[PDB]
Amino acid sequence: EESQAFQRQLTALIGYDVTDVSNVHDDELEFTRRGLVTPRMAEVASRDPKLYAMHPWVTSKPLPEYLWKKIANNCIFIVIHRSTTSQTIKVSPDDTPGAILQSFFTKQDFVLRVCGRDEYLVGETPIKNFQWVRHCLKNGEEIHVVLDTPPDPALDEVRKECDRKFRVKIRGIDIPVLNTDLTVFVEANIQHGQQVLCQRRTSPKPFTEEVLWNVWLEFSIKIKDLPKGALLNLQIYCRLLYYVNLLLIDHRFLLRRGEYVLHMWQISGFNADKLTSATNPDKENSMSISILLDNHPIRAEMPNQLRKQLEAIIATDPLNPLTAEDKELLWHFRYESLKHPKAYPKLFSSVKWGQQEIVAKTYQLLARREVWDQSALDVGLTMQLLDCNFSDENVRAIAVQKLESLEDDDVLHYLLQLVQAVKFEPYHDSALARFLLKRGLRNKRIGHFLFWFLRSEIAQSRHYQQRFAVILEAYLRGCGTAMLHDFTQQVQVIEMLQKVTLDIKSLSAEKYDVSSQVISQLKQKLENLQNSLPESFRVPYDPGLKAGALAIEKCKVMASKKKPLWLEFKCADPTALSNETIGIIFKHGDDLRQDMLILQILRIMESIWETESLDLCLLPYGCISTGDKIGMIEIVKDATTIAKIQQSTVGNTGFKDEVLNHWLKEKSPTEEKFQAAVERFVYSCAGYCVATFVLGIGDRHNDNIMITETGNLFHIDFGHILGERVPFVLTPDFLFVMGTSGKKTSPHFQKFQDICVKAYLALRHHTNLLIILFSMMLMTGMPQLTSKEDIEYIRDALTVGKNEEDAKKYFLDQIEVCRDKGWTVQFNWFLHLV
Ligand SMILES: Nc1cc(C(F)(F)F)c(-c2nc(N3CCOCC3)nc(N3CCOCC3)n2)cn1
Incomplete structure (x- = not known):
């Protein structure tokens, strides 16, 4: 029975019962469950327990140039805590956690944990080579470290557990329901890597709820000649409406034989969904196709x-x-x-x-x-x-x-x-x-x-x-068992939180209406949950953080077109540095997969830029799609939209150049800090400009661009929420921070455009990687995307085929068009949403 409880727990974690047999025509999945066992136990057995337990996060890449600058001492500083006791050691980038450890007692079951997060600095790695350290250098912060015992590896324990030609017979197709009357026919293709080796078509017939041909479609190809991995692809044209596939050679290397009744996928009014061997789970409302294989x-x-x-x-x-x-x-x-x-x-x-x-x-x-x-x-x-x-x-x-x-x-x-x-x-x-x-x-x-x-x-x-x-x-x-436990706590909160989000959305309007009624309702449910709800849970976009109890005082419902919840949680680490809550948005009604794909390419752009010693201050915040049209977003603290910045100074609607600078200086603690903000705005503006251009998501409305009080600018809500054209957004207020009005340069603007160029050329060095990531993301992250036309954008943008000078020229041109357009394009967006 332990087994049932355990398969049920697994089912719960997974969101699908892998033992379900309702939508299958063979034993491939089971076979695969069996097949994967070997590779699992092999790696369980293989892994170093202490290292699996503490998971040090490391790189073997060089420290970028830009970080060595922060340190030329050849000595780094690490603060070590113990309750109130708190010494402040200085170390060598080539120092090891142990060395530094022994070195510390000069002023053995102890290990250094980052303060406030379950991140451990351990193993035979130079300190410079720890990401957290790098992240700390990158943001000008102290490396705060408590000393505590290594986690027990015992908690990571695992529960003990023919020269004939090929032909197929198309019997007929069947649908329960059906608007006009038209002709329908069946197209059978043999495919291997999206190359059709042969094609056969039935004759058209009147489209009635059941249509039968009972025909043999004999192919030019021979049985001997079918490759492993080949697909028998069947499609209905009446305009293509339906499709389904079946692998001609099975998982055991055997030719498919027998009668099959396949429930098809419908095309909404190219993409990877089109190559699936799976059949539609919906038998009650699906179209089916009946066929015969005998070879x-x-x-x-x-x-x-x-x-x-x-x-x-x-x-x-x-x-x-x-x-x-x-x-x-x-x-x-x-x-x-x-x-x-x-x-x-x-x-x-x-x-x-x-x-x-x-x-x-x-x-x-x-x-x-x-x-x-x-x-x-x-x-x-x-x-x-x-x-x-x-x-x-x-x-x-x-x-x-x-x-x-x-x-x-x-x-x-x-x-x-x-x-x-x-x-x-x-x-x-x-x-x-x-x-x-x-x-x-x-x-x-x-x-x-x-x-x-x-x-x-x-x-x-x-x-x-x-x-x-x-x-x-x-x-x-x-x-x-530890990760299982952790995952369970995550799945419970999020499963919980999604309902709350669902109920509230279910009591709330299409228009921008927030009332105490709704918030009351928000807080009440939270109140119910708050009183067990696990004590603590790991933040899914950031596994180092432990989220504690809600701070229901701070939770609200956002005024967005859907009704996202704005939630703030206390951190569950007493070792943490601040009172700051962990802020997470929770939403239904956007497809976060698409956001997820973009922010990951943005992380890829950054790392490319690092190879060439550049840091463009991107802020690809955490985002996970946890279920159908639902998931979570990280809240970057001290951030506001560019549109709000306009709202608060100008009228609620309509656009002053000088406002963004006012905002920054006013938010700045000091001139030192204000001048850092301007410098950060310049880099991040460029980075968003180049990255956004390349992905063809440049043209954006103001409500979907954000900046921090520290000057870091970043885009949001990709995939896609609102829509003369512009390559990217380089508006007069942006120019104004950089020190320019009209067609006049500035030491900062000069700085901005050279960086753009440096950045763009860095990307064109990986033209092939980006084209492939881009084309892949369209195929697996968009619903459907028209093979050749859509993918092609990224080449024109990567300016495939030109030397660097032309490239450099081309991008500066784009900047000029932005200079040309001013507030024109922004204005029309306001109008479109007015
Ligand atoms: N797919 C989506 C959806 C959303 C959301 F929350 F609006 F629905 C967001 C989002 N994400 C945020 N963030 C994320 C980064 O940290 C700051 C807050 N803010 C907003 N706003 C809504 C309108 O007032 C300004 C704040 N929206 C991003 N991607």
Whole structure:
């Protein structure tokens, strides 16, 4: 029975009962639950308990130039606390936590914990190499450290537990309901990495609630020739309305045989949902298609001009399409191509996956894969091999093979996109899934995040939740009883909080109406909850923080188009430094997945900029989508919208240039501090300007841009909340802080535009990585996005194909257009929302 209680607890954590059989036509999921057990226990067993327990967060990257500046002493200062006792040691960047530890007693079961958060500075790592330290240098703060005992690893314990042609028969389609009368027909395709190897169509028939053809669609392709990972894709056109897929080769390497009745997905009035092997859970309202399967298996050197040809091909963007020529060139000279890792995606797209002799040659090629493994890891390339263009398990495994060399810091960087890329795997068990399982179980930070990212999908994607539940379930059985306990506390609060949010939204108006009625109602429910509700819970976007009791006094309902709750919690650490509450917004009615994808690319932009020694002061705040159209947002303290700043000085509606500067100086404690704010505004303004431009989310209304009293500017509410055009927002008030009016420069403005250029060129160095992240995010984070047209934006913006000077020129032009437009575009937004 312990087992039932435990599978039920798991079901509760996960949000889906992986033992559900109601929407399946085979045993792939179970098989996969079984398959993943090995990789779990292998990593549980493998992991160092003390290290798993304390999870030091580290990098092996260089300290950026900009941080060494903060320290030229060659000595850093760390404050060590014990109750009131509090010495203040100074140390060397190359010092180790131990050394410094022993060094401290010069003035053994003790360890240094960051004050107020469950973050531990430990292990054989130079202090400079701890992120928290870096974060502290980055923000000009003292490294406050208490000394306490190491957490007991005992709490991390794990519970002991044919040459025939291929054909298919289309029997008919069936729907319960149906506006006019029109013709309908069925299109069957065989697909491998979104390349259709063959296509057959039935004849049209009148569209009645049941339509039958009972036909054999015999394909040109041979059985022998079907590749593992191939999809039988079935679609109804009447305009395409419905789709479903079925893998032609099963998880055991066997050809599919028998009768299938598949409940289809409908197209709303390209994307990754379109490649799912899953069928629609909705049998009562779904369209179905009935089919029958009755058919288990298993040196000359390149001349000079031609290699010039090859090379040109390789240097093209990932979005460049390849001609029949390019493909032959790539494949006939494959042994040459194998020497250019940068060419592997293009080459593997030139393979005729529908000829078994070729696939066999391809695998051979994979054996002489020497240049590839030697290669310095390239995340652009690796990601490209994990997108919708490759269904081959061996090709994808090599990418995954390069991923193995990522340190945890880097895995945290790409974890969301890596998790999203599992939607591009043909089967539920895959090397990437195993990779992701391994690293979460290896590190608690990655685990924590892997937990929520997988739960995000499970809660809101009928198309991949089954696959993801199995992966999450596997993670849960190796994290340890401590993480389980923690996750349970998180799921309880958020599950709680979402209801409160739901009830209130359910009592509240479409218009901007807040009343004591509503707030009373807000506080009452909070009052109920407040009185058990777990004592403490870990903040999901920031696992170091422990959130304590509500400060119901400070909680309110926000005046936003939905009714987000503004909540403030006491910290649960007595070791913490301040009285400051932890502020979290909680909302239903936005799709946070989309916000989640952007802020992660923004974290990726920052890290790229760090490689080139730049810090553009982005503020990609925490955001998790916890369920369908619901999740949480971090509140950056001391922040207001640019629109409010206008409101409070100018009329409620309509726009003065001088206002933002007034606001900053008035908020500033001192001139020293005011001048720091201006400097921070300049960097962050540029950063948002370049980053936003590249992602094509530049044109924004004022209510959706924010600044802190410290001068840090940041955008909000991506994905998308309100909408002559502008590349980005560089308005007169912004110019004014920087010291300019009209077409006149300033030492600061000069500073702003050179930074923009420095920043933009840094990004174009990773043109390929960004194009692929961007295209991937559209496919897995938007509902649907029109393959070639939408993706293409990022090339024009990355100015693919030009040298640096032209690029530099181009971006300065964009700045001029912003200079040209003033308040024009802002004004029209006000009008659109008036
Ligand atoms: N998808 C979404 C949704 C929202 C929200 F909360 F408005 F619904 C937000 C949001 N996020 C915030 N933040 C987040 C960063 O820290 C400051 C507060 N503020 C707002 N405002 C609503 C109108 O008055 C100004 C404050 N909105 C972000 N992304």
